[PDB]
XYZ file of C-alpha atoms in Angstrom:
395
model
C 140.367 63.397 128.110
C 139.283 59.755 127.934
C 135.514 60.080 128.466
C 135.209 62.926 125.932
C 136.774 60.921 123.080
C 134.581 57.844 123.627
C 131.437 59.982 123.315
C 132.839 61.743 120.234
C 133.551 58.374 118.621
C 130.138 57.009 119.617
C 128.485 59.990 117.963
C 130.676 59.978 114.834
C 130.282 56.289 114.063
C 126.525 56.260 113.446
C 126.143 58.942 110.778
C 126.108 57.084 107.439
C 123.721 59.545 105.713
C 121.719 57.373 103.342
C 121.246 54.139 105.286
C 117.467 54.676 105.192
C 117.365 55.116 101.397
C 119.285 51.967 100.379
C 116.098 50.174 99.316
C 114.794 53.189 97.323
C 118.262 53.378 95.748
C 118.244 49.739 94.604
C 114.651 50.039 93.330
C 115.332 53.088 91.214
C 116.547 54.392 87.851
C 120.208 53.745 88.773
C 120.513 50.099 89.856
C 117.350 48.946 88.018
C 116.407 46.107 90.351
C 112.933 44.591 90.538
C 111.045 44.120 93.793
C 110.914 40.334 93.328
C 114.688 40.229 92.783
C 115.463 42.502 95.734
C 113.125 40.828 98.212
C 113.365 37.133 97.377
C 117.029 36.914 96.369
C 118.874 39.669 98.212
C 117.094 40.070 101.545
C 117.242 36.437 102.812
C 121.042 36.557 102.438
C 121.115 38.983 105.377
C 119.805 36.377 107.841
C 122.055 33.484 106.793
C 125.092 35.762 106.789
C 124.072 37.158 110.182
C 123.984 33.672 111.700
C 127.245 32.667 110.039
C 129.183 35.736 111.195
C 127.450 36.013 114.581
C 128.683 32.625 115.772
C 132.438 33.469 115.338
C 132.493 37.215 116.026
C 131.352 36.949 119.661
C 134.492 34.940 120.521
C 136.812 37.071 118.359
C 135.833 40.198 120.312
C 136.982 38.690 123.622
C 140.283 37.314 122.308
C 141.431 40.293 120.237
C 139.887 42.963 122.511
C 137.364 45.369 121.085
C 139.631 47.699 119.082
C 140.276 45.250 116.180
C 136.550 44.468 116.066
C 135.615 48.156 115.858
C 138.173 48.607 113.070
C 136.626 45.605 111.307
C 133.156 47.136 111.684
C 134.341 50.403 110.150
C 135.997 48.608 107.243
C 132.855 46.506 106.732
C 130.761 49.676 106.476
C 133.269 51.037 103.950
C 132.942 47.786 101.980
C 129.135 48.029 102.077
C 129.148 51.553 100.676
C 131.767 50.635 98.069
C 129.615 47.738 96.840
C 126.557 50.022 96.832
C 128.089 52.589 94.460
C 130.194 50.113 92.460
C 128.088 47.118 91.480
C 125.322 46.113 89.088
C 124.676 42.398 89.744
C 122.843 40.372 92.378
C 125.949 38.659 93.790
C 127.386 42.100 94.550
C 124.276 42.927 96.580
C 124.522 39.591 98.393
C 128.127 40.459 99.298
C 126.805 43.819 100.496
C 124.331 41.938 102.711
C 127.124 39.716 104.059
C 129.216 42.743 105.044
C 126.166 44.469 106.535
C 125.489 41.342 108.598
C 129.101 41.522 109.786
C 128.434 45.080 110.969
C 125.241 44.052 112.785
C 127.039 41.148 114.466
C 129.910 43.393 115.588
C 127.475 46.079 116.827
C 127.447 44.293 120.208
C 130.981 45.332 121.201
C 130.789 49.006 122.224
C 129.003 48.356 125.533
C 131.518 45.705 126.617
C 134.237 47.975 125.237
C 133.200 50.692 127.685
C 132.633 48.294 130.588
C 136.120 46.806 130.382
C 137.710 50.184 129.624
C 136.444 52.783 132.068
C 137.099 51.568 135.694
C 134.665 50.569 138.470
C 132.814 53.227 140.468
C 133.009 55.298 137.272
C 131.365 52.846 134.889
C 127.720 53.894 135.203
C 128.220 57.609 134.481
C 130.398 56.959 131.410
C 127.997 54.267 130.172
C 125.062 56.665 130.526
C 126.974 59.338 128.629
C 127.831 56.959 125.776
C 124.308 55.515 125.564
C 123.062 59.082 125.063
C 125.789 59.889 122.517
C 124.965 56.864 120.334
C 121.247 57.705 120.273
C 121.982 61.327 119.353
C 124.311 60.178 116.570
C 121.662 57.840 115.176
C 118.968 60.556 115.322
C 121.226 63.161 113.681
C 122.059 60.611 110.979
C 118.454 60.256 109.817
C 117.663 63.949 110.270
C 120.665 64.878 108.095
C 119.719 62.289 105.478
C 116.151 63.556 105.205
C 117.242 67.219 105.264
C 119.772 66.494 102.497
C 117.192 64.599 100.404
C 114.244 67.002 100.592
C 115.457 70.537 101.385
C 118.586 70.098 99.283
C 117.774 68.331 96.024
C 120.714 65.966 95.702
C 120.297 62.531 94.147
C 120.779 59.140 95.837
C 124.268 58.808 94.337
C 125.735 61.773 96.233
C 124.283 60.621 99.553
C 126.407 57.496 99.220
C 129.515 59.601 98.539
C 128.832 61.720 101.632
C 128.282 58.504 103.596
C 131.600 57.161 102.293
C 133.379 60.322 103.446
C 131.819 60.017 106.904
C 132.729 56.318 107.074
C 136.355 57.039 106.172
C 136.467 59.717 108.874
C 135.028 57.212 111.358
C 137.662 54.610 110.448
C 140.333 57.266 110.990
C 138.861 58.081 114.413
C 138.708 54.338 115.159
C 142.244 54.318 116.586
C 141.388 54.835 120.326
C 142.777 52.957 123.331
C 143.313 49.235 124.005
C 143.515 47.280 127.294
C 145.834 44.843 129.044
C 142.823 42.758 130.155
C 139.165 42.042 129.460
C 138.239 40.370 132.794
C 135.629 38.499 130.735
C 136.349 34.977 129.463
C 139.763 34.940 127.798
C 141.760 38.101 128.602
C 141.249 37.782 132.350
C 143.917 37.692 135.061
C 142.574 34.930 137.337
C 134.181 30.645 137.987
C 130.503 30.985 138.973
C 130.300 27.470 140.469
C 131.650 26.732 137.075
C 129.401 29.209 135.339
C 127.339 26.110 135.171
C 125.981 25.509 138.564
C 125.694 29.236 137.928
C 123.323 29.104 134.970
C 121.575 26.085 136.497
C 120.629 28.093 139.577
C 119.821 30.921 137.153
C 117.475 28.846 134.970
C 115.736 27.786 138.172
C 113.845 31.124 138.148
C 110.296 31.680 136.814
C 111.036 35.200 135.507
C 114.118 34.163 133.502
C 112.273 31.496 131.466
C 109.463 33.942 130.673
C 111.376 36.835 129.125
C 113.911 34.642 127.306
C 111.216 33.030 125.146
C 109.755 36.492 124.560
C 113.223 37.658 123.513
C 113.668 34.795 121.047
C 110.317 34.731 119.280
C 109.251 38.376 119.407
C 112.717 39.622 118.425
C 112.649 37.211 115.475
C 109.319 38.624 114.308
C 110.359 42.219 114.991
C 113.547 41.920 112.958
C 111.741 40.217 110.074
C 109.262 43.108 109.908
C 112.056 45.686 110.216
C 114.039 44.027 107.419
C 111.116 43.820 104.977
C 109.287 47.066 105.792
C 111.087 49.341 103.282
C 110.128 47.096 100.336
C 106.464 47.658 101.259
C 106.548 51.475 101.203
C 107.675 51.212 97.566
C 104.745 48.970 96.622
C 102.321 51.539 98.046
C 103.983 54.612 96.509
C 106.397 53.941 93.584
C 107.795 57.478 93.389
C 110.814 58.039 91.146
C 111.320 61.491 92.705
C 113.920 61.452 95.492
C 112.356 64.427 97.260
C 109.143 62.797 98.515
C 110.624 59.724 100.210
C 110.432 60.130 103.991
C 112.284 57.020 105.178
C 114.772 59.206 107.037
C 112.011 61.143 108.790
C 110.246 57.888 109.682
C 113.431 56.422 111.176
C 114.187 59.648 113.063
C 110.672 59.597 114.532
C 111.057 55.902 115.419
C 114.326 56.635 117.255
C 112.713 59.465 119.248
C 109.683 57.331 120.136
C 111.871 54.420 121.219
C 113.900 56.690 123.507
C 110.729 58.184 125.004
C 109.162 54.738 125.519
C 112.291 53.153 127.030
C 112.528 56.005 129.544
C 108.849 55.496 130.412
C 109.478 51.765 130.956
C 111.955 52.525 133.718
C 109.392 53.153 136.425
C 107.334 49.998 135.847
C 110.033 47.321 135.876
C 110.240 46.432 139.577
C 106.510 47.112 139.963
C 104.089 46.021 137.224
C 105.872 42.656 137.145
C 103.295 40.374 138.713
C 101.409 40.619 135.420
C 104.461 40.135 133.183
C 102.308 38.046 130.832
C 99.382 40.454 130.528
C 101.837 43.149 129.411
C 103.362 40.830 126.804
C 99.906 39.769 125.623
C 98.732 43.360 125.211
C 101.859 44.620 123.468
C 101.984 41.595 121.155
C 98.307 42.038 120.254
C 99.046 45.681 119.419
C 101.990 44.583 117.264
C 99.752 42.025 115.525
C 97.145 44.715 114.847
C 99.761 47.112 113.448
C 101.343 44.664 110.968
C 97.793 44.027 109.733
C 97.393 47.765 109.087
C 100.729 47.710 107.252
C 99.622 44.697 105.189
C 96.169 46.189 104.448
C 97.110 49.578 102.965
C 97.062 49.896 99.173
C 96.162 53.482 98.246
C 99.216 55.583 97.301
C 97.648 58.543 99.160
C 97.498 56.648 102.487
C 101.258 56.397 102.928
C 101.033 58.543 106.078
C 99.464 55.525 107.823
C 102.311 53.226 106.734
C 104.944 55.625 108.075
C 103.017 56.036 111.351
C 102.220 52.335 111.853
C 105.950 51.531 111.780
C 106.833 54.282 114.264
C 104.383 52.828 116.806
C 105.516 49.273 115.994
C 109.122 50.072 116.931
C 108.003 52.139 119.917
C 105.964 49.265 121.359
C 108.903 46.836 121.091
C 111.311 49.221 122.847
C 108.875 49.308 125.779
C 109.582 45.713 126.828
C 113.329 45.566 126.061
C 114.272 47.408 129.306
C 111.766 45.268 131.229
C 113.009 42.001 129.690
C 116.660 42.937 130.238
C 116.138 43.830 133.906
C 114.240 40.617 134.695
C 116.597 38.336 132.755
C 119.692 39.944 134.313
C 118.614 40.387 137.925
C 120.393 37.634 139.888
C 123.141 37.058 137.295
C 126.772 38.087 137.453
C 128.301 40.192 134.675
C 130.086 37.207 133.108
C 126.935 35.061 132.850
C 124.523 37.761 131.657
C 126.689 38.364 128.573
C 126.470 34.632 127.810
C 122.703 34.413 128.385
C 122.081 37.453 126.165
C 124.188 35.811 123.446
C 122.421 32.466 123.716
C 119.076 34.263 123.362
C 120.334 36.139 120.279
C 121.625 32.936 118.651
C 118.263 31.202 119.147
C 116.358 34.223 117.810
C 118.514 34.203 114.654
C 117.913 30.470 114.185
C 114.142 31.106 114.137
C 114.636 34.080 111.805
C 116.639 31.894 109.413
C 114.033 29.111 109.459
C 111.123 31.474 108.783
C 113.083 33.373 106.122
C 113.974 30.188 104.251
C 110.411 28.860 104.412
C 108.660 32.073 103.355
C 110.874 34.615 101.608
C 113.618 32.699 99.774
C 113.155 31.540 96.178
C 114.117 28.020 97.324
C 111.065 28.032 99.581
C 107.621 29.559 99.079
C 108.878 32.813 97.540
C 106.019 35.058 98.668
C 105.519 38.781 97.948
C 105.821 41.353 100.729
C 102.089 41.674 101.475
C 101.591 37.925 101.957
C 104.691 37.885 104.162
C 103.231 40.664 106.312
C 99.934 38.769 106.553
C 101.813 35.726 107.847
C 103.745 37.951 110.268
C 100.488 39.361 111.650
C 99.179 35.809 112.104
C 102.440 34.925 113.899
C 102.082 37.833 116.314
C 98.417 36.957 116.882
C 99.367 33.379 117.796
C 101.974 34.597 120.286
C 99.471 37.039 121.801
C 96.855 34.290 122.186
C 99.376 31.965 123.846
C 100.488 34.662 126.288
C 96.913 35.697 127.113
C 96.002 32.070 127.806
C 99.015 31.724 130.102
C 98.086 34.908 131.956
C 94.503 33.677 132.357
C 95.814 30.359 133.685
C 97.766 32.393 136.248
C 94.383 33.541 137.585
């Protein structure tokens, strides 16, 4: 029973009921944080910490094999939810953001875990099972959070206790099995023309230099919007009642829409790529027009548009991720694709850090959330214009 335990662990490692209400919890009658404090001081710390931990942790997952890294991720989640409940300062919340960044950086280990674990000629079925288990766990997480906030009238303090119980159970389940080999990088048994004539021949491809730049810049913008969105739903509707906050429902709907849209972008990935710049232009223009709707909504009774303009914003980004991944990793080996997808992520985080320092940090411009979203919409518009001009030049 090896395949059954990996799916059980993939499901019961995503629960964390109350990950969608962290921002309402900080901006509430318990922590008593102000929106300026939260945004400008606490949220930039996520990006710097993400860069700082991301650079080491990719090499510490190869060397140690994935079991120590998954244990570290579980303990980091436990630390995050211990700093959430216990803590009343800003430095405590910045430590919380450092640990959360550690979790995000280590979140890139389960796929390689499974790949090196299963066995060939069995890898695809087990990978498909585990990719479905993780999505179901994430969906059930938000559905349980929203059903425990609204239907059952518990406060935001008890959600964190339930989350802590689930996290402890996950760390207990985090024992699982370890390898004698990785076959990637360090724990091999023993090239790719040194993987160097390899990535040279790889970079000599028009379709690999087109989706990598998309990856970098559009992922930077996407993650900025995702990070700062929850501080904008509080500006619109400052409700002190924890029974009319639908962050969990919004995230559950976003997860369903992303899974529907990624399945739909499985037919048009070998076709519909002769116009791989008209697609990017259209989707980026839609994303630019949705962040404008987010930034131009002020009435407290029009919050249904802010919840629904984020669901479509995440759904439109998950359309091109399967298409970008297939075109980037099409003539690559398995050892070089993992390096290319890490180089793209590092460069996206560099841009995120630069923009965050310039705009959001108090040692930069220090702008409120609405002005930040205006600048983000302008950013997406510029990318859409550039891509449309390139596509027109193609014809």
